[PDB]
Design a protein around this nucleic acid. Structure first.
Ligand SMILES: [Mg+2]
Length: 580
DNA sequence: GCGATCACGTA
DNA sequence: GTACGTGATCGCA
């Protein structure tokens, strides 16, 4: 039951057809500067396994890889493209990416290797990567006979699966989403990852030294306030100190024991001086271990850059995620953490960081999709949307909006976006369920088109079994019919939230493609470095800043046409922190 | 070493 | 209540 293929000693012309399934295998999780362990080609003329030392030194093979008119079908072509970039080799002509095709057809499947995608079309003549390479410490590259068969089977699967996947994308009206949005974006993300972001490691180390002294001070304050030493990092040990020794009231339970979440601790602060010190310890220790030590661990000493990996085929909404490091959760809310961003610097002297962010893109998308007259008019007037929402639900003039009224309207606006619920709003504003219900009802009285949209999209999700975004991304919601209230209610909130969050994701991806094209047309040296969901981060020569100030907001604002304007804020400076 | 759990940072 | 990734602990081998 094995496959017939050539174990090739040299590259022949028949391996260089103008259409082929191509496998450029990178087994290490983090593919930056990682080994390519083997290569398989399936085309009209046969099935071929090439050792990479042979293939990647062959001028004809490298020219074929780089020829845009030689079309390749692959799985996770960004992984191969980036690993080849580190070897100075350009991958072009990737016309079909099976990982992205499977992701668009059903993000919930968790498709992470060829075998999982193949199973979607009843094709099982390929093993899961985990069965071949192993898991964790057992992970290893097998001997060439076993490796070569696996790589040819993956290429053979890709060769056979392109047509049924493209046929279903076509029936879904998602063919352009793959070919004009996700596949071009993959090349852009590959360039961004390869370029990396320069880190000022000396400044991080100096911050780490300052945190370690502060942490030493707080931890001794906690040990004297507790009258005892314990592992403050251990939620169990801390729970014994607070709730058994010090007898603090138990306000929240976790499945395992006592909650020690920052939410609970804030409420316990009036009872004992220790609680404020634990919160302070938690803040500082999060910065030190996750953002100082964690960041320093993944800076490449050869470049002094971090080279993130964007996962383009993971989230259920169409957002990107970012790993090793995750550069989409660098602190910004609190000032002490915000100073971490001073460590992210331009990669050349006399360059600057330029950052541009959409203003309230998710509420603007909702205004467009719901066609809510009041919400649309608020954005057409470029109002402060949280102040305007407070005015409406409290029925007060703008000068009667107090800071706390705006804070509660902002929390409603966040809930509306995320799938509004009695319980989650109540928990967030620390109010009762009945009170949160009244807030939501007053919101829907002020925004009746938003109410109609929320009712209609839930009905559409039940009828069709999925919801869609502006650019035809879809998310299936089988739990929408569950008779379990909690399971059904989460699916209803996803029906509400996904067209909003997913459409905002669609727009920023289109902005990234349009921006990359405009930068090349303008012959700017400016480079995209990062996307953080509603924001784009670039670096550029300081002599390009004035041009970027006009170009980048205009490209982002024109990425799609909605019934309301899109608004982009932007800043630049010497570090990511100063791009504020 | 592995996985369940808790906590917390972003959007 | 959205969507994630990471670090630490802990009890299991
Ligand atoms: Mg913003």
């Amino acid at each position: 039951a094995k496959m017939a293929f050539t174990l090739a000693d040299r590259v022949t012309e028949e391996m260089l057809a103008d259409k082929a399934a191509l496998v450029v295998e990178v087994v290490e999780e983090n593919y930056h500067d990682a080994p390519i362990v083997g290569i398989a080609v399936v085309n009209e003329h046969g099935r071929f396994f090439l050792r990479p030392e042979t293939a990647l030194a062959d001028p004809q093979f490298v020219a074929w890889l780089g020829d845009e008119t030689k079309k390749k079908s692959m799985f996770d072509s960004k992984r191969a493209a980036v690993a080849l970039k580190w070897k100075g080799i350009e991958l072009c002509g990737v016309s079909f990416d099976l990982l992205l095709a499977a992701y668009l057809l059903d993000p919930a499947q968790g498709v992470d290797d060829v075998a999982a995608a193949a199973k979607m079309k009843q094709y099982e003549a390929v093993r899961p990567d985990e069965a071949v390479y192993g898991k964790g410490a057992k992970r290893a590259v097998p001997d060439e006979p076993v490796l070569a068969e696996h790589l040819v089977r993956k290429a053979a699967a890709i060769w056979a699966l392109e047509r049924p996947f493209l046929d279903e994308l076509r029936r879904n009206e998602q063919d352009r989403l793959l070919v004009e949005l996700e596949q071009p974006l993959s090349s852009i993300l590959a360039e961004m990852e390869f370029a990396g972001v320069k880190v000022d490691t000396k400044r991080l180390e100096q911050m780490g030294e300052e945190l370690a002294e502060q942490l030493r001070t707080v931890e001794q304050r906690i040990y004297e306030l507790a009258g005892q030493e314990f592992n403050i990092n251990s939620p169990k040990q801390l729970g014994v100190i607070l709730f058994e020794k010090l007898q603090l009231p138990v306000l929240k339970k976790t499945k395992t024991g006592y909650s020690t979440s920052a939410d609970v601790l804030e409420k316990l602060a009036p009872y004992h001086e220790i609680v404020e010190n634990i919160l302070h310890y938690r803040q500082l220790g999060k910065l030190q271990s996750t953002y100082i030590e964690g960041l320093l661990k993944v800076v490449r000493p050869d470049t002094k850059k971090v080279h993130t990996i964007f996962n383009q085929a993971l989230t259920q909404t169409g957002r990107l995620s970012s790993t090793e490091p995750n550069l989409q959760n660098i602190p910004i809310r609190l000032e002490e953490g915000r100073k971490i961003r001073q460590a992210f610097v331009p990669s050349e002297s006399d360059w600057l960081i330029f950052a541009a962010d959409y203003s309230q893109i998710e509420l603007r998308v909702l205004a467009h999709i719901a066609e809510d007259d009041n919400l649309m008019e608020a954005f057409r007037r470029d109002l402060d949307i949280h102040t305007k929402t407070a005015m409406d639900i409290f029925q007060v003039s703008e000068d009667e909006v107090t800071p706390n009224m705006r804070r509660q309207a902002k929390a409603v606006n966040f809930g509306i976006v995320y799938g509004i619920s009695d319980y989650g709003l109540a928990q967030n504003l620390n109010i009762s369920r009945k009170e949160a219900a009244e807030f939501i009802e007053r919101y829907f009285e002020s925004f009746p088109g938003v109410k109609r949209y929320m009712e209609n999209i839930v009905q559409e999700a039940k009828q069709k079994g999925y919801v869609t975004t502006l650019l035809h991304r879809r998310r299936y919601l089988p739990d929408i019919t569950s008779r379990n209230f909690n399971v059904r209610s989460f699916a209803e909130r996803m029906a509400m939230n996904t067209p909003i969050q997913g459409s905002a994701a669609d727009i920023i991806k289109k902005a990234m493609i349009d921006l990359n094209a405009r930068l090349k047309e303008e012959r700017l040296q400016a480079r995209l470095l990062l996307q953080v969901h509603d924001e784009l981060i670039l670096e550029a020569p300081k002599e390009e800043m004035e041009r970027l100030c006009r170009l980048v907001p205009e490209v982002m604002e024109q990425a799609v046409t909605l019934r309301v304007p899109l608004k982009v804020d932007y800043h630049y400076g010497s570090t990511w922190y100063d791009a504020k």
